[PDB]
Amino acid sequence: AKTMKKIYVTMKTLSPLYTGEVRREDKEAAQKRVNFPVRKTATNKVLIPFKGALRSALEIMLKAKGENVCDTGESRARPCGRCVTCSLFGSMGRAGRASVDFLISNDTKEQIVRESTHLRIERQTKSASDTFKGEEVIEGATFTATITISNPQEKDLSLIQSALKFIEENGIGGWLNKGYGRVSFEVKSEDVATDRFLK
Amino acid sequence: KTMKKIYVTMKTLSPLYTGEVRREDKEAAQKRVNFPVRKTATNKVLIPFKGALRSALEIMLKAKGENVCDTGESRARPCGRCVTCSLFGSMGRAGRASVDFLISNDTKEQIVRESTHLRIERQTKSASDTFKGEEVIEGATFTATITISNPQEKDLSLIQSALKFIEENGIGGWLNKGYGRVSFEVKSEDVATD
Amino acid sequence: AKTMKKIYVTMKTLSPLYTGEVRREDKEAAQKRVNFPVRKTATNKVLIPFKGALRSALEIMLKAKGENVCDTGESRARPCGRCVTCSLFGSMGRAGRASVDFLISNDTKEQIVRESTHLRIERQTKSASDTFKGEEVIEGATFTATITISNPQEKDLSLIQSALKFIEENGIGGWLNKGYGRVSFEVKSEDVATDRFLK
Amino acid sequence: KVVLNINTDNMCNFASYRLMPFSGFIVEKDDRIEINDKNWFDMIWNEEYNKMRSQPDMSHDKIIENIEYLFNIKILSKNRIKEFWEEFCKGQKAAIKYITQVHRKNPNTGRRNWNPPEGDFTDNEIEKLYETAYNTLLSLIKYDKNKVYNILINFNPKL
Amino acid sequence: TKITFYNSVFIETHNGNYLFSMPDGNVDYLILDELIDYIERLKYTPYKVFLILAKRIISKKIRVELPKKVVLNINDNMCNFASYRLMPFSGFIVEKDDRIEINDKNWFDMIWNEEYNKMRSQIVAEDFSALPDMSHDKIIENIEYLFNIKILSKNRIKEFWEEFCKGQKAAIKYITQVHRKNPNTGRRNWNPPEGDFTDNEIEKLYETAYNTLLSLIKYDKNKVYNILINFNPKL
Amino acid sequence: VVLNINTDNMCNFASYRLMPFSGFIVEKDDRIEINDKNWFDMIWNEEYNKMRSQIALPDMSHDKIIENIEYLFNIKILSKNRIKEFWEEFCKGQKAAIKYITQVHRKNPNTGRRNWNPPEGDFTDNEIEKLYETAYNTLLSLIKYDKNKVYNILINFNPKL
Ligand SMILES: [Zn+2]
Ligand SMILES: [Zn+2]
Ligand SMILES: [Zn+2]
């Protein structure tokens, strides 16, 4: 109420990282060169969606405990509005308490994005059957985000860290089964007064 | 007498979305994008700016200690006594600040892109629902001009405080998933004689 | 979905190992000095793709056994979704249940990567006709991966271990017909709960 | 004058001096011998490279049968119809160019850029289906825009 | 973990029978005059005692200790000087992702040479800054013939275009390097022509490739790109 | 800022004049100096001498140097292996380069053989010995010049060294 919990999350990549470009025009311009462009700014810095990864982590883990969290991931499935995940990240008619920012890179695309050759090899002949260039983010690339919890509760920070420990195990972004997206999160939280700027 | 003028240039730091209010243009765009971005017919992006500055000063001043009138509530009818109703509006007298829409400097073809947003299942880990929403690219320079008549001493500082609250929470929509984080650069001017 | 099988995989090289650099800028910069660069992280560690090797292993073994397994690997082939390899590794609908991480070294390129001279020898003259240089990974180099099976079935570790034996017998990546890539695997299988992180 | 554009934050202290090894580019100007980093040269290499580079006939009732078949054995898809419709709206010539590009069998691999048929087809039936796709879309070239849109709108409702 | 309490917490793991401060069992680590007898009372004298007192208990033939990533030294001739065994060593600690190596000057000299070779071999003279003459059709004819037979390949056309973007001089440098007949081997870096031939004919097609590529560097970039894009569609 | 680097070997990349470099930003009292590897070798000898303590090269002109290196490269004395190993000893310090050229030129007192590669072609024994002494004098004059100009001189005869 009178405080906000600001979780400054700094994430390093322990693996090549791919998250796909969403922007039609940028993707269409890049498919002249690379069939799988990476999601960037016009400031030329890599953007990663972060709220949905945290929500997916907490729904799978809190449903694995047996708590009555809903699933906001099926087709047509609506948030119920009574879970701890619905309180932390939102419901239809109830805005989320966590203002999860995008994972914005510290470096620019020339430093951390590399165009990479990926293949499909025929099983019998052991020869290349398909080739495709795709952009990926290098290892050791640092990304920063801020998760700003409004109306702070007790569990929240630990919940976020627990969700981060899910993303440290599985990954963030795309091509997660192939080995991509393995990352390491470091947390620096701070409880701050919501009237910090009025002075 | 001397009305206070605040030129507010805004630079987009994470992709911006503000949904389109006009039903006919939204219906025209619904074919290409499920969520069209709020656009002028001069092919420029306008952003609502009064309500975010208001709600910034509402939550900051409410938890500060100065009692205010919670607008955007179930009934949301404000008083004519507290500080926000003396700045951003009251149910009786006009608000002392005229907050222009954050018009863009650039055009639709230079900042506005359509994007694939997604909903992924948590067991199959595949896209359940896909939709196409429009955003504004980062580094896009918008401009607005706040007009505080009858200037009190705690006016420019309060507007700057609200802009810092907007720089950390965001302007527009889809604010919790990371859309809307921006920076604000501010210049001020009193005008006396014409 | 309550459990999660973590297969920690430790691979020691019994032969020289090569896997080519896929990153265009890094390949070109290394091709100013060595004609066949080995695949490398930005943290100077050696990265073999591992999901495709396991999937190819299981596809030839399960096609030999006479099972209902399709052939991802043929040019732009569509996974059916009804095999066991589509369950463990993915289809166009559901993703793979096993998140196969890259086989990352515990060592750095200074310690394990050597530049080696390879030849083409004319048959009648018995002299060197062509010469090239290739980066390879030394014998006894130890690589690690962690396969993470979500919704673990009972025949999942057995198939992973069978694929590990097939990768031991055919080689992991690179010039497998010349003698490169002969490796050995150690399997630290476990079964963790999904709510391990939630405290 | 000398300006160090390299970041000065991280610096060890060996032999009682604050020293730091760097690997950068000493660059000339009108009067500024400036030390600019690796990223600066990636800026100018990208800038200079991008600057120097930046400077037949068939029945409509048979056509409907062909696009149905080639949409049911997955040679023709929503993406193919989408790019076909964009290239049709940019002209006749560029759409023939796109259909040529997709049908072009590379002599090195013998691979065309279509999507492979699923099902137990052998070699020359797949080749005949590729030829069918070529002649069907290239017969659709000469038709007028309204008829091509009504033909394609059954298969890809977005375009 | 077998724990027993005495008038003293005697945890008995498999990594040592620790005891924070006398049981009759074997005690491995004693987490500790009056003090000396307590140690003398223990049968099977402890390996280490975790404490003036230390001087004496060292002379009682007993080890003491007085109150992250693995550190590996790579640097080993030491000396007795000032009692403790010791050597002067100046070096470099490096912080790897799972370890901390302690390297010396030869490692830094090695990586200095390895970085200097990368630095010096990145800019080659007038990057992005007397050619023979040929008609445009003759360039089309010879590049088409030397693309059918495998001399001018897609990789050769690509690497021609990349160096010709970097100027005319770098393109002449690349073409002279590819055409160069090494005096020790008698071989050019052209990919050999496919089809049955004769060494005079092969040498003349190599000369034809040299003259047709050299006559193309005098042409305008857009004209060079529109000649080569019919062969290598990427560049 | 005080550059302790000779500002030569500067190519013209587009509308820019520049020089690839690797050195040390040794921030000191108000200098923030830019010193090369030779200063770091001095500094390492400073430390590895001080810490232990607690316990005439000829001038031959540059064009004559290219001329002599070219002549010796075509008569198979200064081969590519010799240029490569000279570069490896030159990057290891000038003293190691004096040691290497002395080791290669040393006529062994018993055998009477130098460690150069023999001249290919008809040359008399006195002429062969004068060519060997020319190799010693030319590479010994190349030891004086700085690392960048020696890289430019040696890259036109050995493209990978
Ligand atoms: Zn819910
Ligand atoms: Zn009020
Ligand atoms: Zn299948």
If you write DSSP's letter for every residue of A32-89 in order, what string do you get? TT-SB-B-B-SSS-BEE--HHHHHHHHHHHHHHHT-----S-STT----S-SHHHHHH
Q: What residues of chain B lie within 8 A of the CB of A109, using their CB?
A: none
Give the 3-state secondary structure of residue D148: helix
Distance (Å) from CA B89 to ligand 1 centroid: 36
Chain B residue nearest residue C2, CA to CA: B123
Q: What residues of chain E lie within 8 A of the CB of C45, using their CB?
A: 97
- Put simply, whether B124 touches C (Cβ < 8 Å) is yes
As a whole number of angstroms, the distance between CA C150 and CA C154 comes to 12
| CA of B118 vs chain C CAs: smallest distance (Å) | 15
Across the interface, whether the CB atoms of A197 and B60 are under 8 A apart is answered yes
Across the interface, whether the CB atoms of A73 and B164 are under 8 A apart is answered no
Q: Enumerate residues 79 to 98 of chain B having a beta carbon within 8 A of any beta carbon in chain A.
A: none
As a whole number of angstroms, the distance between CA D47 and CA D30 comes to 21
Distance (Å) from CA C83 to ligand 3 centroid: 4
How far is the CA of E167 from the CAs of C170, D38, E220, in angstroms?
47, 22, 11
- Put simply, whether C3 touches B (Cβ < 8 Å) is no
| List of chains touching F (3+ CB pairs within 8 A) | D, E
By DSSP bridging, strand A113-121 and strand A47-48 are unpaired
Q: How many CA atoms lie within 13 A of E227 on its CB side?
A: 25
- Put simply, whether F42 touches D (Cβ < 8 Å) is no
Residues 6+ apart with CB under 8 A from B81: none
* Buried-exposed string D49-75: b where 16+ CB fall within 10 A, e elsewhere: eeebeeeeeeeeeebeebbebbbebeb
**B98: which strand partners?**
B147
Counting CB pairs under 8 A, whether chains D and E reach 3 or more, is yes
**E16: which strand partners?**
E13
Counting CB pairs under 8 A, whether chains C and E reach 3 or more, is yes
Identify whether the C-beta of residue D22 lies closer than 8 Å to the C-beta of residue D29. Answer: no
Chain B residue nearest residue C88, CA to CA: B124
Alpha-carbon torsion (A90, A23, B184, B80), positive or negative = negative
| CA of B123 vs chain C CAs: smallest distance (Å) | 8
Residue type, F90: F
At which residue do the structure tokens 């929240």 appear?
Answer: A156
Chain C interface, mutation test: which of E96, E122, E191, most C Cβ atoms within 10 Å? E96
As a whole number of angstroms, the distance between CA B87 and CA B97 comes to 6
As a whole number of angstroms, the distance between CA C22 and CA A133 comes to 9
Give the 3-state secondary structure of residue E225: helix
Identify whether the C-beta of residue A50 lies closer than 8 Å to the C-beta of residue A58. Answer: no
Q: How many CA atoms lie within 13 A of A116 on its CB side?
A: 24
- Neighbouring C-beta atoms of residue A145, cutoff 10 Å: 21
Q: What residues of chain C lie within 8 A of the CB of E121, using their CB?
A: 32
CA dihedral of residues E5, E6, E12, E17 (deg, nearest 10): 150
User: What tokens appear for C185 in the block?
Assistant: 């695997």
Chain F residue nearest residue D52, CA to CA: F14
How far is the CA of C197 from the CAs of A166, A168, E184, in angstroms?
7, 11, 66
| List of chains touching B (3+ CB pairs within 8 A) | A, C
| CA of C77 vs chain D CAs: smallest distance (Å) | 7
| CA of F91 vs chain D CAs: smallest distance (Å) | 16
User: What tokens appear for C136 in the block?
Assistant: 């390879």
Residues 6+ apart with CB under 8 A from C89: A177, C51, C54, C55, C58, C96, C98, C100
As a whole number of angstroms, the distance between CA D144 and CA D60 comes to 12
Q: Of all residues in chain A, what percent are helix, strand and coil, respectively (each to 5)?
A: 25, 35, 40
Method: cryo-EM
- The beta-carbon neighbor of A139 closest among C43, C71, C195 is C43
DSSP-derived secondary structure letter, A178: G
Q: Of all residues in chain D, what percent are helix, strand and coil, respectively (each to 5)?
A: 50, 10, 40
